[PDB]
A paper describes a structure:
Here, we determined the three-dimensional structure of MCP2201-LBD in complex with the repellent malate at 1.8 Å resolution and found a malate-bound MCP2201-LBD dimer in the asymmetric unit, similar to that observed in ligand-free MCP2201-LBD. Malate was bound at an internal pocket surrounded by all 4 helices, which overlaps with the citrate-binding pocket. Specifically, residue R135 interacts with 1′-carboxyl group of malate via hydrogen bonds along with the potential interaction between negative and positive charges. Residue T108 forms a hydrogen bond with the 2′-hydroxyl group of malate. Residues T105, Y138, and R142 form hydrogen bonds with the 4′-carboxyl group. The significant difference between malate- and citrate-binding pockets was that the ligand’s carboxyl group (coordinated by residues Y138 and R142 in both cases) forms a hydrogen bond with T105 in case of malate, but in case of citrate, this residue is not involved in ligand binding, but instead 2 other residues, R81 and T104, form hydrogen bonds with the ligand. In contrast, the malate-bound MCP2201-LBDs primarily formed dimers (apparent molecular mass of 34 kDa). Residues S69, N72, and S73 were involved in a water-mediated hydrogen bond network at the malate-bound dimer interface, but not in the ligand-free dimer interface. The free energies of malate-bound (−14.5 kcal/mol) and ligand-free (−10.8 kcal/mol) dimer formation calculated by PISA support a more stable malate-bound dimer than the ligand-free one. We propose that the malate binding induces the displacement of helices α1, modifies the dimeric interface, increases the dimer formation, and then alters the orientation of the helix α4 C-terminus (via the dimeric interface interaction between helix α1 in one subunit and α4 in the other subunit).
Previously, we reported that a transmembrane chemoreceptor MCP2201 in a gammaproteobacterium Comamonas testosteroni CNB-1 recognizes several tricarboxylic acid (TCA) cycle intermediates and mediates a positive chemotactic response towards these compounds. We also identified a binding site for an attractant citrate in the MCP2201 LBD, which, similarly to Tar-LBD and Tsr-LBD, adopts a four-helix bundle fold. Here, we identified malate as a repellent recognized by the MCP2201 chemoreceptor in a bacterium Comamonas testosteroni and showed that it binds to the same site as an attractant citrate. We found that malate and citrate affect the oligomerization state of the ligand-binding domain in opposing way.
Author numbering:
A (entry chain B): 57 to 198
B (entry chain A): 58 to 200
The structure:
């Protein structure tokens, strides 16, 4: 019972950490004049990506509420926009197109990452609220 | 239940901050751009302040021998981690790219790995306590 929202809270926390890491890395890539940084960080980026893939596969079978499914649907859509803009920033920086990379970071990547993190926060708060309610019942009702 | 849950959430935020800082410092050390240090200074300071606030909240809640022992070890290694992080940033800002990369590999990465390993152990202490309590609840409700 309780372990359901507990497990989902932990998985979503890992996911949120992965996105925060990826945002810091993409920000550093976009602000560095070094066109080679993308390739230097490719292995780290791949580890972050695969970590999130693992989280997603674990979260999917645990989704039990319509609200969770709607939020997750929105997350996956926003995530598509985020991935496209992240990849565009990396491509432009690798090609030395610093100005266009900045335009993309500001107009596309930042809003997508912010929406991504906001929706992850909503799903996380959903789990935390369910778990907090059950924990309060267990403590008080005893 | 609320005690280990609060600690688990605070430690999760802490761990996220450390992972972000490690990614940022790695990017700084691998970039040929000496200016990245200054460009990311505000973000790095915000990560630092976030962890400081987490520590202020978690310290009074860490009361039992095992968690206190792990926390003491974390703070010890964290001293080395901070020193090496600051060294990496300083060498990069000073144009000592080669020395900054060497410091990243020989000093910063080992400290960061020990820091993250001990944070993971503290987090797992909280998670194991919560798992045990939740399982006890499921047992009671099953009878």
């Amino acid at each position: 019972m309780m372990q359901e929202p507990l497990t989902k809270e932990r998985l979503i926390s890992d996911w949120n950490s992965n996105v925060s890491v990826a945002v810091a890395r993409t920000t550093a890539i976009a602000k560095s004049s070094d066109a080679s940084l993308v390739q230097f960080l490719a292995a780290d980026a791949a580890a972050t990506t695969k970590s999130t893939a693992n989280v997603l596969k674990q979260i999917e079978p645990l989704i039990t509420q319509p609200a969770e499914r709607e939020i997750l649907d929105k997350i996956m859509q926003v995530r598509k926009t985020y991935i496209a803009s992240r990849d565009k920033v990396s491509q432009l920086k690798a090609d030395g197109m610093a100005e266009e990379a900045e335009s993309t970071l500001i107009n596309s990547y930042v809003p997508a990452a912010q929406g991504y993190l906001k929706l992850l926060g909503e799903l996380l708060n959903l789990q935390r609220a369910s778990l907090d309610a059950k924990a309060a019942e267990v403590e008080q009702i005893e």
